Design a protein around this motif. Structure first.
Motif, PDB file in Angstrom:
ATOM      1  N   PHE A  40       0.905  -1.105  -0.056  1.00 19.24           N
ATOM      2  CA  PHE A  40       0.111   0.028  -0.008  1.00 19.24           C
ATOM      3  C   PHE A  40       0.770   0.947   0.084  1.00 19.24           C
ATOM      4  O   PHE A  40       0.604   2.277  -1.124  1.00 19.24           O
ATOM      5  N   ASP A  41       1.909   1.359   1.055  1.00 24.36           N
ATOM      6  CA  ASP A  41       2.591   2.262   1.000  1.00 24.36           C
ATOM      7  C   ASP A  41       3.722   2.525  -0.169  1.00 24.36           C
ATOM      8  O   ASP A  41       3.692   3.857  -0.779  1.00 24.36           O
ATOM      9  N   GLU A  42       3.824   1.675  -0.959  1.00 23.27           N
ATOM     10  CA  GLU A  42       4.729   1.447  -2.229  1.00 23.27           C
ATOM     11  C   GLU A  42       3.692   2.204  -3.367  1.00 23.27           C
ATOM     12  O   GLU A  42       4.114   2.756  -4.349  1.00 23.27           O
ATOM     13  N   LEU A  43       2.251   1.955  -3.064  1.00 19.17           N
ATOM     14  CA  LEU A  43       1.432   2.497  -4.065  1.00 19.17           C
ATOM     15  C   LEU A  43       1.256   3.998  -4.013  1.00 19.17           C
ATOM     16  O   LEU A  43       1.715   4.719  -4.935  1.00 19.17           O
ATOM     17  N   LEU A  44       1.016   4.517  -2.697  1.00 17.88           N
ATOM     18  CA  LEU A  44       0.991   5.986  -2.610  1.00 17.88           C
ATOM     19  C   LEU A  44       2.423   6.902  -2.890  1.00 17.88           C
ATOM     20  O   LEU A  44       2.292   7.739  -3.440  1.00 17.88           O
ATOM     21  N   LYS A  45       3.351   5.767  -2.696  1.00 15.69           N
ATOM     22  CA  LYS A  45       4.741   6.596  -3.097  1.00 15.69           C
ATOM     23  C   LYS A  45       4.691   6.389  -4.582  1.00 15.69           C
ATOM     24  O   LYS A  45       5.216   7.844  -5.047  1.00 15.69           O
ATOM     25  N   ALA A  46       4.169   5.708  -5.400  1.00 13.32           N
ATOM     26  CA  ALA A  46       4.109   5.901  -6.926  1.00 13.32           C
ATOM     27  C   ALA A  46       3.157   6.922  -7.300  1.00 13.32           C
ATOM     28  O   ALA A  46       3.408   7.754  -8.040  1.00 13.32           O
ATOM     29  N   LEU A  47       2.311   7.327  -6.238  1.00 19.06           N
ATOM     30  CA  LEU A  47       1.268   8.546  -6.650  1.00 19.06           C
ATOM     31  C   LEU A  47       1.911   9.651  -6.211  1.00 19.06           C
ATOM     32  O   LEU A  47       1.194  11.035  -6.150  1.00 19.06           O
ATOM     33  N   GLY A  48       3.012   9.913  -5.414  1.00 14.34           N
ATOM     34  CA  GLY A  48       3.760  11.103  -5.200  1.00 14.34           C
ATOM     35  C   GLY A  48       3.582  11.530  -3.712  1.00 14.34           C
ATOM     36  O   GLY A  48       4.045  12.722  -3.223  1.00 14.34           O
ATOM     37  N   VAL A  49       2.928  10.787  -2.820  1.00 14.33           N
ATOM     38  CA  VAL A  49       2.584  11.186  -1.545  1.00 14.33           C
ATOM     39  C   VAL A  49       3.988  11.023  -0.735  1.00 14.33           C
ATOM     40  O   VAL A  49       4.723   9.941  -0.790  1.00 14.33           O
ATOM     41  N   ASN A  50       4.481  12.046  -0.119  1.00 10.29           N
ATOM     42  CA  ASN A  50       5.878  12.143   0.830  1.00 10.29           C
ATOM     43  C   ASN A  50       5.623  11.384   1.745  1.00 10.29           C
ATOM     44  O   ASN A  50       4.861  11.154   2.476  1.00 10.29           O
ATOM     45  N   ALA A  51       6.886  10.782   2.159  1.00 11.56           N
ATOM     46  CA  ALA A  51       7.012   9.810   3.460  1.00 11.56           C
ATOM     47  C   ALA A  51       6.134  10.143   4.540  1.00 11.56           C
ATOM     48  O   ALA A  51       5.351   9.136   4.838  1.00 11.56           O
ATOM     49  N   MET A  52       6.092  11.284   4.978  1.00 14.61           N
ATOM     50  CA  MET A  52       5.286  11.694   6.273  1.00 14.61           C
ATOM     51  C   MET A  52       3.629  11.537   5.814  1.00 14.61           C
ATOM     52  O   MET A  52       3.079  10.856   6.725  1.00 14.61           O
ATOM     53  N   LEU A  53       3.210  11.983   4.909  1.00 26.18           N
ATOM     54  CA  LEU A  53       1.728  11.909   4.617  1.00 26.18           C
ATOM     55  C   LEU A  53       1.344  10.547   4.404  1.00 26.18           C
ATOM     56  O   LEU A  53       0.562  10.034   4.743  1.00 26.18           O
ATOM     57  N   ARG A  54       2.219   9.995   3.468  1.00 25.73           N
ATOM     58  CA  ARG A  54       2.221   8.534   3.420  1.00 25.73           C
ATOM     59  C   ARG A  54       1.922   7.549   4.379  1.00 25.73           C
ATOM     60  O   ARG A  54       1.035   6.860   4.395  1.00 25.73           O
ATOM     61  N   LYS A  55       2.629   7.682   5.502  1.00 24.49           N
ATOM     62  CA  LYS A  55       2.562   7.181   6.636  1.00 24.49           C
ATOM     63  C   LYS A  55       1.291   7.203   7.230  1.00 24.49           C
ATOM     64  O   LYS A  55       0.595   6.412   7.728  1.00 24.49           O
ATOM     65  N   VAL A  56       0.790   8.573   7.484  1.00 28.87           N
ATOM     66  CA  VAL A  56      -0.393   8.722   8.135  1.00 28.87           C
ATOM     67  C   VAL A  56      -1.904   8.343   7.240  1.00 28.87           C
ATOM     68  O   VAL A  56      -2.525   7.909   7.770  1.00 28.87           O
ATOM     69  N   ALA A  57      -1.534   8.484   5.788  1.00 27.78           N
ATOM     70  CA  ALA A  57      -2.565   7.841   5.026  1.00 27.78           C
ATOM     71  C   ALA A  57      -2.833   6.478   5.132  1.00 27.78           C
ATOM     72  O   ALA A  57      -3.845   5.966   5.140  1.00 27.78           O
ATOM     73  N   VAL A  58      -1.649   5.808   5.410  1.00 27.24           N
ATOM     74  CA  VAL A  58      -1.572   4.180   5.496  1.00 27.24           C
ATOM     75  C   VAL A  58      -2.518   3.796   6.660  1.00 27.24           C
ATOM     76  O   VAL A  58      -3.247   2.998   6.710  1.00 27.24           O
ATOM     77  N   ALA A  59      -1.926   4.346   7.850  1.00 28.19           N
ATOM     78  CA  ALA A  59      -2.518   4.223   9.064  1.00 28.19           C
ATOM     79  C   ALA A  59      -3.907   4.445   9.050  1.00 28.19           C
ATOM     80  O   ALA A  59      -4.641   3.449   9.497  1.00 28.19           O
ATOM     81  N   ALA A  60      -4.550   5.580   8.428  1.00 31.62           N
ATOM     82  CA  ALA A  60      -5.961   5.665   8.428  1.00 31.62           C
ATOM     83  C   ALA A  60      -6.915   4.906   7.587  1.00 31.62           C
ATOM     84  O   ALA A  60      -7.888   4.346   8.097  1.00 31.62           O
ATOM     85  N   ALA A  61      -6.361   4.258   6.635  1.00 36.23           N
ATOM     86  CA  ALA A  61      -7.089   3.477   5.657  1.00 36.23           C
ATOM     87  C   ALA A  61      -6.758   1.637   6.328  1.00 36.23           C
ATOM     88  O   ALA A  61      -7.049   0.936   5.626  1.00 36.23           O
ATOM     89  N   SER A  62      -6.103   1.766   7.654  1.00 36.48           N
ATOM     90  CA  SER A  62      -5.811   0.296   7.995  1.00 36.48           C
ATOM     91  C   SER A  62      -6.846  -0.620   8.559  1.00 36.48           C
ATOM     92  O   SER A  62      -6.603  -1.848   8.713  1.00 36.48           O
TER      93      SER A  62
END
Lengths: 136, 136
Positions: free
Chosen positions: B15-37
């Motif tokens: 999932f995290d690698e997906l967001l990374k592909a989408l341009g989400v920076n490390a910090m946001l990516r972290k929070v985004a993943v947590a929220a949709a867990s």
């Protein structure tokens, strides 16, 4: 007293707006504004030296710096930047930020201990976000 | 059996690698993943008409669509897009996503029913994220 101690957030203001200034899109902004109210900050102050822990019960973000000497960290929205802390006055540290990767909004933050509360202020150009902390 | 039912998530990979592909920076990516867990899916199916309510603490979406005709929604990173849901096979829905504005990596999703499991697949360029749901 000084900045040392455990701090809990009392109120946040204009945070969502700041994030928009920094270009965070609606959804990410939303997950971001939410997750920001859960952590507790723990400051270790030793002269110009600081060690701040923004924790929870399963996560923790730690950083150290020395007021008067540049250091590196990340702007609120997650961008890499060099920061320059200086004492504006006895109860207030002011920190200018300069991005490393790319060009964007002028970021800055200040920490001030006033009335035994920690007032953190974020700047992203003409937008200003403010949050108050109370000793836990 | 079919797609209709109440679902819970038992696994999320890349999932995290997906967001990374989408341009989400490390910090946001972290929070985004947590929220949709800890998602809670509720699907209502009527032939080709689908109703998928996904309730997560910070964000709830109630997407309606008819396999065979387009509709609109947002990519996993919040971009406006036009989606085209179509049958890849009797029990799998492939869905092409077109950015209406912005323009970035090609994204899409697929929802397949394999052994009373809802395989939700997200893809962005070469990156693919896989989340498995189970009947609650």
């Amino acid at each position: 007293p000084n900045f040392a101690g455990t701090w809990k957030m009392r109120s946040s203001e204009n945070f969502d707006e700041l994030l928009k200034a920094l270009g965070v899109n609606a959804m990410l902004r939303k997950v971001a504004v939410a997750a920001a109210s859960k952590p507790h900050v723990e400051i270790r102050q030793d002269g110009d030296q600081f060690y701040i822990k923004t924790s929870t019960t399963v996560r923790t973000t730690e950083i150290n710096f020395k007021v008067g000497e540049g250091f590196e960290e990340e702007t609120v929205d997650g961008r890499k930047c060099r920061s320059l802390p200086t004492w504006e006055n006895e109860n207030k540290i002011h920190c200018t930020q300069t991005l490393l990767e790319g060009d964007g909004p002028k970021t800055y933050w200040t920490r001030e201990l006033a009335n035994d509360e920690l007032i953190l202020t974020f700047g992203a150009d003409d937008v200003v976000c403010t949050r108050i902390y109370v000793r836990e």
